[model samples]
Target: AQLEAKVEELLSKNWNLENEVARLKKLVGE
Candidate 1:
């Protein structure tokens, strides 16, 4: 639950890396 918690926590806190990666992928057409 530890790493899982950080994912939701960070997501809830604000858009973070995973979100950024997703956005970047679309931006670069990945």
Candidate 2:
């Protein structure tokens, strides 16, 4: 159960980073 929680946390973080990158790309006109 602990490992599963960790995996979910990491996935959430990764998604946040991906969204941030997309936002920056749009701001930069990419």
Candidate 3:
């Protein structure tokens, strides 16, 4: 149960990071 929760948390963070990277890239004057 704990492992499953951890995996979910990590995936959530990864998803957020992916979106954030794309957001910043657009605002980086590119």
Candidate 4:
């Protein structure tokens, strides 16, 4: 659980890149 907590913090930092990559992936039909 402690490690998962850090994942959320990391995600917050990369949230924008995450969203961008997600949309790009969709466009590429991945």
Scored by lDDT, the top model is: 2
- The best-first sequence of candidates by TM-score reads 2, 3, 4, 1
Per-prediction TM-score: 0.45, 0.92, 0.74, 0.54
lDDT of 1 by residue, 1-30 (tens): 799999989777676777888999999999
In angstroms, how far off is 5's CA in candidate 4? 18
Q: Per-residue alpha-carbon lDDT of model 2 for 1-30, expressed as tens digits? A: 899999999999999999999999999999
User: lDDT, candidate 1, residue 10?
Assistant: 78
Q: Which stretches of candidate 1 lie over 4 Å from their true place?
A: 1-15
Pairs with backbone N, CA or C atoms under 3 Å apart (clashes), candidate 4: none
Instruction: Kindly indicate the candidate among 2 and 4 with the higher TM-score.
Output: 2
Per-residue lDDT, model 1, residue 23, is: 97
**What are the per-residue Cα lDDT tens digits for candidate 3 across 1-30?**
899999999999999999999999999966
Clashing pairs in 1: none
- Considering every candidate listed, which one attains the maximal TM-score? 2
lDDT, residue 17, model 1: 71
List all candidate RMSDs to the true structure.
Answer: 5.3, 0.4, 1.2, 4.7
Per-residue lDDT tens digits for candidate 4, residues 1-30, read 899989988988799888999999999999
Candidate 2, after superposition: displacement of residue 8 in Å? 0.2
Error of 1 at 15 (Å): 6.0
